[PDB]
Amino acid sequence: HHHHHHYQLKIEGQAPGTCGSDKSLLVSALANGIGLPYECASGGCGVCKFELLEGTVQSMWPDAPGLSSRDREKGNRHLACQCIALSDLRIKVAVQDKYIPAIPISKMEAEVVAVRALTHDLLSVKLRTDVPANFLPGQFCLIEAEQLPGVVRAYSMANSMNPDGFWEFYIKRVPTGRFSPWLFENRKVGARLFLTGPMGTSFFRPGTGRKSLCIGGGAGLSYAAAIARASIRETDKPVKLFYGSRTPRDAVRWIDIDIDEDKLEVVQAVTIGFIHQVVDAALLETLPEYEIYLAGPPPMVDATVRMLLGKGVPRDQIHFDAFF
Ligand code: FES
Ligand SMILES: [Cl-]
Ligand SMILES: [Cl-]
Ligand SMILES: [Cl-]
Ligand SMILES: [Cl-]
Ligand SMILES: [Cl-]
Ligand SMILES: [Cl-]
Ligand SMILES: [Cl-]
Ligand code: NI
Numbered sequence: 001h002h003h004h005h006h007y008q009l010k011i012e013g014q015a016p017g018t019c020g021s022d023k024s025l026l027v028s029a030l031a032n033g034i035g036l037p038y039e040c041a042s043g044g045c046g047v048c049k050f051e052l053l054e055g056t057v058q059s060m061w062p063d064a065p066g067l068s069s070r071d072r073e074k075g076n077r078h079l080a081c082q083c084i085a086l087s088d089l090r091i092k093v094a095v096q097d098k099y100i101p102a103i104p105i106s107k108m109e110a111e112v113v114a115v116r117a118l119t120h121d122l123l124s125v126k127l128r129t130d131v132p133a134n135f136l137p138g139q140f141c142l143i144e145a146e147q148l149p150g151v152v153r154a155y156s157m158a159n160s161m162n163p164d165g166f167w168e169f170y171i172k173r174v175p176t177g178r179f180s181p182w183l184f185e186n187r188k189v190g191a192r193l194f195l196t197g198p199m200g201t202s203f204f205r206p207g208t209g210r211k212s213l214c215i216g217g218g219a220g221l222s223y224a225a226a227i228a229r230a231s232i233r234e235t236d237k238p239v240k241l242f243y244g245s246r247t248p249r250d251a252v253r254w255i256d257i258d259i260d261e262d263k264l265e266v267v268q269a270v271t272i273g274f275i276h277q278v279v280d281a282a283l284l285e286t287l288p289e290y291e292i293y294l295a296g297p298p299p300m301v302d303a304t305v306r307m308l309l310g311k312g313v314p315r316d317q318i319h320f321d322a323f324f
Helices: 025-031 068-074 219-236 275-289 298-312
Strands: 007-009 016-019 048-053 056-057 076-078 083-085 089-092 108-116 122-129 140-145 150-156 168-171 190-198 209-216 239-245 264-270 289-296 318-321
Touching: 016 025, 016 083, 016 219, 025 076, 056 076, 108 219, 122 190, 122 219, 140 168, 150 168, 150 219, 168 219, 209 219, 209 275, 209 298, 219 239, 219 289, 239 275, 264 275, 275 289, 275 298, 289 298, 298 318
Parallel strands: 007 089, 209 239, 209 289, 239 264, 289 318
Antiparallel strands: 007 016, 048 076, 048 089, 056 083, 108 122, 108 190, 122 168, 140 150, 140 190
16 A cells, blocks of 8 residues: 555646645645635535546545535536546636745644643644644644545644744544544654645734634644644734633633633633534624634634624635645
8 A cells, every 4th residue: 555656737827836746736736835725624614625527536535424415426526625636637716825835835744742631622633744843833644544545634733833843733522423543542752644734724813903702622722722822922912812622611721722821811601502602692792803713613713703794804814724
């Protein structure tokens, strides 16, 4: 389960690049500097849709919900984040500049170096690469475990850009979901994984002059924490942060995540109704004045953005990441 092939990737209107049997069309494109649209990079949001003009591809997730029942059954529309090339390809997609990697993405061999209890639910995993850890606050990595070849999943970085090559992620204590590269044989010090990134365009925006509100459900606390840290570093203003954990009062040691608890206004929502009703109650009609960042389970993120827009928050002050 080790050899891979390389093929030509022609994107109509762009320079002929390369693609392969070893990575998705998304990352090959992005790796080539092309702004192929994407958000989730994991088969759910539908944003990376392209039309297969010619050539043959293989899907990592045939049931991927980002592709509608219609599209899965009729025509030549596929998802770039889920598809590998099995020959030279010609595709058509609306390329945009805002998706060009801020920082050149790469395939990195990374070793687990530290694991520690974040919360009753969250486990923090710190890995090291031979290369500097270079990423913006709010970006993610796609993570693979050689045990499971076709099992790429997305995880927001929790720490910050450092020259020591450290990448931290928050993962679930209970192995739920379904398939994950975080087998328990891989949550031990010395395990080797593969990080692709940095990915994502929902990173922190400086110079807004607005206050930050970070909303993180479940493992989305990684993203929420990286934005909160970066806001405090920027302005020293108070950052309001809301998060969901199922057990009452499971505090996170904010000094271990390099965050000053002063300049930090934390409200936990114990996992009736949920997190976006706790935010709406607490802040009322003041939300439109904040720069808002969310992460979490797709249903939670979608409900919250609906609440936000319904409460008059400009679309361009809302930033999010939801992975499937
Ligand atoms: S980016 Fe491919 S479905 Fe979300
Ligand atoms: Cl990939
Ligand atoms: Cl697909
Ligand atoms: Cl790459
Ligand atoms: Cl997990
Ligand atoms: Cl949640
Ligand atoms: Cl989550
Ligand atoms: Cl930072
Ligand atoms: Ni082969």
